[PDB]
Amino acid sequence: PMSTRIAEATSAIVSKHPARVGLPPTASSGHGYQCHVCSAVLFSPLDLDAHVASHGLHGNMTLTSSEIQRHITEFISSWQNHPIVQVSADVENRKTAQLLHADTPRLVTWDAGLCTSFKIVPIVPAQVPQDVLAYTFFTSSYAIQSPFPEAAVSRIVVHTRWASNVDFDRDSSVIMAPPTENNIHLFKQLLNTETLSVRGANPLMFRANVLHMLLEFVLDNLYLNRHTGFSQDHTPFTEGANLRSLPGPDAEKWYSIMYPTRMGTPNVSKICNFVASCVRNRVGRFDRAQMMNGAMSEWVDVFETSDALTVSIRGRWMARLARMNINPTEIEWALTECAQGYVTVTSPYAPSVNRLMPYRISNAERQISQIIRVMNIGNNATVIQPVLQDISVLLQRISPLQIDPTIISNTMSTVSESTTQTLSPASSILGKLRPSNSDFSSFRVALAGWLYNGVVTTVIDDSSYPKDGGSVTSLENLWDFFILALALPLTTDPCAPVKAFMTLANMMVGFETIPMDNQIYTQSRRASAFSTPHTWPRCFMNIQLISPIDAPILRQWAEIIHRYWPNPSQIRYGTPNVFGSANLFTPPEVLLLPIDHQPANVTTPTLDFTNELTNWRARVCELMKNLVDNQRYQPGWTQSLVSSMRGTLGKLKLIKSMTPMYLQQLAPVELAVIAPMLPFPPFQVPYVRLDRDRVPTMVGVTRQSRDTITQPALSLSTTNTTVGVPLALDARAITVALLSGKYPPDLVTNVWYADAIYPMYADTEVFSNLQRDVITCEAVQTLVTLVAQISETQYPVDRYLDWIPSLRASAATAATFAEWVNTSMKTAFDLSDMLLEPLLSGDPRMTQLAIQYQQYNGRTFNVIPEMPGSVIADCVQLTAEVFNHEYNLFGIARGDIIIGRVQSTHLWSPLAPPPDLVFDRDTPGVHIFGRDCRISFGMNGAAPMIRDETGMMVPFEGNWIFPLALWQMNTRYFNQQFDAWIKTGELRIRIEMGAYPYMLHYYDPRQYANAWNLTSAWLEEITPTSIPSVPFMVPISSDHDISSAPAVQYIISTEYNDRSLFCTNSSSPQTIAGPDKHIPVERYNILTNPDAPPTQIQLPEVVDLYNVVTRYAYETPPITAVVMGV
Amino acid sequence: EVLLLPIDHQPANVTTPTLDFTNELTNWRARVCELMKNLVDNQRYQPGW
Amino acid sequence: VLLQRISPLQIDPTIISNTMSTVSESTTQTLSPASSILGKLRPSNSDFSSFRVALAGWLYNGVVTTVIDDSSYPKDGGSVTSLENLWDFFILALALPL
Ligand SMILES: [Zn+2]
């Protein structure tokens, strides 16, 4: 195909390998290995073919292939030498595009269902046909639906809302099985890349995986409840109550599920025993806020079934968004003050519908996001450049100034030149001032370099310095000195005046001498190599060391630089009322400009001659005429060339130019208008003119700590990371636009700017970056909060899950876990680009955020922004506390198990054993086996022993205490021995675990039951890496009198773990045999307690299943449909 | 019984920080990086850049 | 090879590239120092027998001694005016104490 052929043609025309390397030049490694006339070396193809051609005599010059190829190589060498195409790119690179426009997050998401997270599931069906009680008792026979499912045994499990008519899904769920089914696939998710058993999981990552599950459980409860209408009741179950009708095709079961106090109470079943013990005026709607006659009601408060945990979480998220809320009046004020007059917008003045637009954030969040952007943009030349090109092409469409280099030719055609004399000072200018690729963009790139100096430093490229020379006698070098002396103050490098002076010190060498500081940076050194405040000459800093008798020209040029160089100023853009300013190391609401700015007073601009740039051009022309008037410096220039040069220079001083006036009094207003509508905000270290003091010699960022130390103000000076890049420009392209600028012939500035500026503020993209800032700051704070749980960090974190065992975390574990947190937050919130990723390149454990620059003398200013609050980390810590008190609902049990043969006809549940079967470390006559425990064999009928902690030998009897890791590390040996001895003998082992998931196996109490086939499989499947779930054999509670059967149980618990039970034998009148439990009265505080106010949660201890919840109808339109105007 | 090493050793734990200047080789890398930073700082040695 | 098969320490070179990514290369007249150290470290190689034999020679100080090759030194003495010899000195001064 064609693109291969055209690409080969490009590679043929552009690449002869002249490519530049950085090395000392050696006599071996030269491109001219053997030049084929005389066998020398010249290190470059252009000089090599010049060597081949120069030995041929110049009357015998015939065009041939090599003669063409020399011009080809010279052409491509100068084209690659040009700096704008040295640093350029056509396409994006996933970093510049991410900086230029980032993905917005999806904050507002609305739930139309009901807020819950804890469902109720039946397990075993209740015996509805039975002989002792006729079937006409039960409400199941009449198909009366109930809020609670009828069953013999019912438990509550955890589901992500199971009812939510959701607007937008967040793909992160904690869908859980009932505890009869297996449940270890949730707890083997995180760091189990090694557990080959499907049914197994490593106990050393339980804490990490459980709190990652808590993170996903919080992130799936980030919604707002939405108002979904009501309907006045017509059946007399609840008099006058207003019931919410949630949308969907099926709406039958929902009223009975939502309103447990609505049903009738016909019998003495346990459900009706609960419902007859309820209050009745606490159903449905009880509050609303009507603001308009027959519009959508603003917010209502309803009694319904709910979950107080997720009610609290959605309340915190709503408090966050209500803190972000703004109003169109402040939007109008911020946009008008931002645009400084010219464009007006309108906001309507009427009673509203109480809308919601989350956009206001804080200065701390803005500064933290700016630190993350500068950490992104660190040391890359090809990332900062397209932002400057964007600002350049945007400034070209707002600037009324145009560039007409026919002005310089039309004012050139008045100078008188004799046809006789060989030097034409007029035509040298017109041959020289045409720039290299004829681009004029270097001017606007220099203005964008005024906007940004902390990350990019615009210097003037080597290719404009006047060709490894000097020679004040040479007219071309004189014009190059004038061009460079005009072009240098517009760039933003802090070492511009020393380059300006040492250009002239390079220009005259041998005419006038001047002392230097060593023999490295002598007078004959190229001026562009200095570029550092350590290289500034002492003779330049001290004017006394230049003698007026030897160097009067250099002394007065130094005085002109020291006194007449342009001064820095400021413009005061923006507003921090809305979108608080991201300025750092500068105060907010200020910009810095390297030239002076007074503002204009009229709107019809004309030409006058009073500003510092025309003053600078006048002083440069004045010194160059003092230089050319001297006859000893150019003795070959007789009379008419001297007078013609004087007149050309005076005329060039008095050209009618408009670019200095434009830079003096129109372009700072444009920069102040542009700069808040900009995706990368300004980032400025202070400008300073001539001194070897206060010059920014570095600027650096940090992302981690150093040692045992904790304070960022101490760690920053050794954990900084230097950010910055130089950038090259074109001196001729700056100078011709400086000399040849014109306004339109009839322009009025307010009409022109009110025309040009309005399409910018028509676009409203800038409000969609502050939500990305919200999510960035929430991400970094929840990262440090979560890593602080499993590892040791510096922040005063609260610890809740210390009782669950976990791995001794290393930096690889922490980095992997932080990657999991990043992936979870990216798959929520609807964004796919680089978030939290610059922090992952270092250690995630010891992170911090700070920034500093350093002056020349040693002063370091720092900005350590305070870390603001974070509702996501708040809700995760709340979920951790309430999981500590309610651990049983997520499948976790606490404590440890005791493996021992228990044979009885009793019906006690193994999740609540009677307290004499258990034993502790403090129980007398109990052995502990933490240490070596070498089992010695028996012989000649004597029993075998095992070695105590205290160094004793004990037979295989009694009560033992193992750590789990001991059995885990010596599984098969201990399996053979102790699985022989447990099943019939009198041995009992307590295996200390802390945390473990489990399964439940129900059985008929009327028949025989033995659990060896369940426990022995678990004991065999305990591996050195993983363990499988712990099987419990729990009976089934009955409604009536039953018989008894011997049941043989082996694994028992230690403390109460039967919290997930919920109303066994519900439709029955009572429970006779087995574990009994009524409705938990503590869960329904509002029904059962007439003293309890409506808004009450006992949230840390228990979780209520029924509370007041608010529901909203706040509409969210875009800004352009509310605030508009022209 | 001893085995001579050309490097210092400490008791082993996996939960020790990555940036620890108690460590000899981390200290060595830090000092070499700081000296080459001091070398490239002033630009005294490199004209022609 | 026994140390390589027993050792927990896995070595991959992608940490260096992820720290100093610097994707662009189209500047064919200058040369960035990050590109210099990537092209000099050469992360595309996957050989570390020099590291494992450097670990093994501590047991046999008394018969063999490990030195750094001549080609790892700067060419023709080197000088500080060259970025390549600066990076050569950095790599050498890190590699010497083993
Ligand atoms: Zn030759």
TrEMBL record, chain A:
Annotated InterPro entries: Lamba1_VP3 (IPR054176), Lambda-1/VP3_sf (IPR044949), Znf_C2H2_type (IPR013087)
Chain residues that bind Zn(2+) 2: C35, C38, H51, H55
Gene3D superfamilies: Inner capsid protein lambda-1
UniProt KW keywords: ATP-binding, Capsid protein, Helicase, Hydrolase, Inner capsid protein, Metal-binding, mRNA capping, mRNA processing, Nucleotide-binding, T=2 icosahedral capsid protein, Virion, Zinc, Zinc-finger
A Pfam family that the UniProt record links to this protein: Lamba1_VP3
A cellular component annotation (GO) from this entry: T=2 icosahedral viral capsid
Main localization, broad class: virion
Single annotated GO MF: zinc ion binding
Keyword Heme found: no
Signal peptide as annotated in the record: none
Sequence positions that bind Zn(2+) 1: C35, V37, H55
A GO biological-process term: 7-methylguanosine mRNA capping
Domain (C2H2-type) ranges: 35-55
Coiled coil: none
Location(s), subcellular: Virion
Protein purpose: Inner capsid protein that self-assembles to form an icosahedral capsid with a T=2 symmetry, which consists of 120 copies of VP2, with channels at each of its five-fold vertices. This capsid constitutes the innermost concentric layer of the viral mature particle.
Designated name of the protein: Lambda-1 protein
Primary gene name: L3
